[PDB]
Write an enzyme that holds these catalytic residues in place. Structure first.
Site, PDB file in Angstrom:
ATOM      1  N   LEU A  15       5.006   2.794   5.991  1.00 18.20           N
ATOM      2  CA  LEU A  15       4.694   1.466   6.568  1.00 18.20           C
ATOM      3  C   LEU A  15       5.430   0.381   5.790  1.00 18.20           C
ATOM      4  O   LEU A  15       5.743  -0.675   6.336  1.00 18.20           O
ATOM      5  CB  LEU A  15       3.194   1.157   6.552  1.00 18.20           C
ATOM      6  CG  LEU A  15       2.312   1.944   7.491  1.00 18.20           C
ATOM      7  CD1 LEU A  15       0.859   1.799   7.086  1.00 18.20           C
ATOM      8  CD2 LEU A  15       2.539   1.536   8.956  1.00 18.20           C
ATOM      9  N   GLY A  18       7.790  -1.454  -1.783  1.00 12.84           N
ATOM     10  CA  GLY A  18       7.754  -2.667  -2.588  1.00 12.84           C
ATOM     11  C   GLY A  18       7.225  -2.376  -3.972  1.00 12.84           C
ATOM     12  O   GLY A  18       6.033  -2.079  -4.126  1.00 12.84           O
ATOM     13  N   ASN A  19       8.134  -2.442  -4.978  1.00 17.28           N
ATOM     14  CA  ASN A  19       7.928  -2.173  -6.410  1.00 17.28           C
ATOM     15  C   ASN A  19       6.487  -2.458  -6.923  1.00 17.28           C
ATOM     16  O   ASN A  19       5.979  -3.572  -6.763  1.00 17.28           O
ATOM     17  CB  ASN A  19       8.977  -2.907  -7.264  1.00 17.28           C
ATOM     18  N   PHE A  20       5.812  -1.439  -7.501  1.00 16.93           N
ATOM     19  CA  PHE A  20       6.354  -0.086  -7.719  1.00 16.93           C
ATOM     20  C   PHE A  20       5.650   0.988  -6.858  1.00 16.93           C
ATOM     21  O   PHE A  20       5.432   2.123  -7.312  1.00 16.93           O
ATOM     22  CB  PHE A  20       6.336   0.268  -9.219  1.00 16.93           C
ATOM     23  N   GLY A  21       5.334   0.628  -5.615  1.00 18.76           N
ATOM     24  CA  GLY A  21       4.669   1.544  -4.698  1.00 18.76           C
ATOM     25  C   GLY A  21       5.068   1.507  -3.233  1.00 18.76           C
ATOM     26  O   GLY A  21       5.830   0.644  -2.781  1.00 18.76           O
ATOM     27  N   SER A  22       4.503   2.459  -2.482  1.00 23.24           N
ATOM     28  CA  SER A  22       4.688   2.602  -1.041  1.00 23.24           C
ATOM     29  C   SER A  22       3.328   2.543  -0.337  1.00 23.24           C
ATOM     30  O   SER A  22       2.313   2.930  -0.918  1.00 23.24           O
ATOM     31  CB  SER A  22       5.349   3.942  -0.731  1.00 23.24           C
ATOM     32  OG  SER A  22       4.548   5.042  -1.141  1.00 23.24           O
ATOM     33  N   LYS A  42      -1.889   3.437   0.043  1.00 26.33           N
ATOM     34  CA  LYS A  42      -1.056   2.895  -1.028  1.00 26.33           C
ATOM     35  C   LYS A  42      -1.109   3.842  -2.192  1.00 26.33           C
ATOM     36  O   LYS A  42      -2.171   4.355  -2.523  1.00 26.33           O
ATOM     37  CB  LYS A  42      -1.535   1.495  -1.479  1.00 26.33           C
ATOM     38  CG  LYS A  42      -0.515   0.753  -2.379  1.00 26.33           C
ATOM     39  CD  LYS A  42      -0.893  -0.685  -2.659  1.00 26.33           C
ATOM     40  CE  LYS A  42      -0.393  -1.679  -1.618  1.00 26.33           C
ATOM     41  NZ  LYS A  42      -0.422  -3.105  -2.095  1.00 26.33           N
ATOM     42  N   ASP A 128       1.351 -13.761  -4.415  1.00 28.81           N
ATOM     43  CA  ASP A 128       2.406 -13.318  -3.501  1.00 28.81           C
ATOM     44  C   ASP A 128       2.096 -13.680  -2.057  1.00 28.81           C
ATOM     45  O   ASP A 128       2.383 -12.890  -1.170  1.00 28.81           O
ATOM     46  CB  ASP A 128       2.585 -11.786  -3.648  1.00 28.81           C
ATOM     47  CG  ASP A 128       3.953 -11.231  -3.256  1.00 28.81           C
ATOM     48  OD1 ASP A 128       4.958 -11.953  -3.424  1.00 28.81           O
ATOM     49  OD2 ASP A 128       4.026 -10.050  -2.872  1.00 28.81           O
TER      50      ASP A 128
END
Ligand SMILES: *CCC(=O)N1CCC[C@@H](Nc2ncnc3[nH]ccc23)C1
Length: 274
Positions: A15, A18-22, A42, A128
């Site tokens: 989906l 983005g640092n440091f995960g998916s 996540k 963010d």
């Protein structure tokens, strides 16, 4: 219910990254017959990063709002959230721009402001806030997501100083974040102003925060910080209602203490309608 067995989480697609995960689209399928519910999962793709991820999970688990992405549970390692097939607001605004009117944009703005007001009451700084980080539940319902950078404010301090500078596009950061890595609920208000601008441009790439700041624009960060210190701001989006633009300008006050609060913005957004 709140514990998801790893063997029952079936991978479908990515989906996001983005640092440091998916974030992955998974089906929680204990029957193994493709009839189980879809979930957003996540995970980290690090020792300090592991501490960061567990903090994110504790922040999201403790949040309970209609304007914040729902925490479902964890799998042991992974954070399980509700899946929103409409996806991010940025891409949604581009696909439906000929359909969503000023009222609708104002409704999304109100819902996000309500969500931020609630985060603030939790002493939570998002850090963010951007249209790409906000999810669409339905045509008339948005939710704040991606708490990967979120910080809990101690009871005696209303701001937080980050050690290493940011890794996010610089065009959403407040002047005090750019200059000193200071983040607070007031720097979230600045970012919210950029979200209002994103909404009223329908996240059009040609007049996007990056595209337009770059053409108004020595390192780029120092040059953006220079533009901002001089009082230069993003232009009113094409066909933007004056009042909405006046609100973006307020969110963009040079000093953090002069920016309106989320509790003051809400009745104002609601008064403009939806
Ligand atoms: C703009 C692309 C997009 O839709 N994104 C960015 C990458 C992460 C995505 N996250 C996500 N999508 C659907 N449902 C979700 N629940 C929790 C997080 C979710 C959004």
């Amino acid at each position: 219910p709140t514990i998801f067995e790893e063997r029952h989480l079936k991978y479908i697609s990515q989906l996001g990254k983005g640092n440091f995960g998916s974030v992955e689209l998974c089906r929680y399928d204990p029957l193994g017959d493709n009839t189980g519910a879809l979930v957003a999962v996540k995970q980290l793709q690090g020792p300090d990063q592991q501490r960061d991820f567990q903090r994110e999970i504790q922040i999201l688990k403790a949040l309970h709002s209609d304007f914040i992405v729902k925490y479902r549970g964890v799998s042991y390692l992974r954070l399980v959230m509700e899946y929103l097939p409409s996806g991010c607001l940025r891409d949604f605004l581009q696909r439906h721009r000929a359909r969503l009117d000023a009222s609708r944009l104002l409704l999304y703005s109100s819902q996000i402001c309500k969500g931020m007001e609630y985060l603030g009451s939790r002493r939570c700084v998002h850090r963010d806030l951007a249209a790409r980080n906000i999810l669409v539940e339905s045509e008339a319902h948005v939710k704040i997501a991606d708490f990967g950078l979120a910080k809990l404010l101690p009871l005696d301090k209303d701001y937080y100083v980050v050690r290493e500078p940011g890794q996010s596009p610089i065009f959403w950061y407040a002047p005090e974040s750019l200059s000193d890595n200071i983040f607070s609920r007031q720097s979230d208000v600045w970012s919210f102003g950029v979200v209002l601008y994103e909404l009223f441009t329908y996240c059009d790439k040609s007049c996007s925060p990056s595209a337009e700041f770059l053409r108004m624009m020595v390192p780029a960060l120092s040059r953006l910080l220079e533009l901002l210190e001089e009082g230069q701001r993003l232009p009113a989006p094409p066909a933007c209602p004056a009042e909405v633009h006046e609100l973006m300008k307020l969110c963009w006050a040079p000093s953090p203490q002069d920016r309106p609060s989320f509790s003051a913005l809400g009745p104002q957004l609601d008064m403009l309608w939806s």
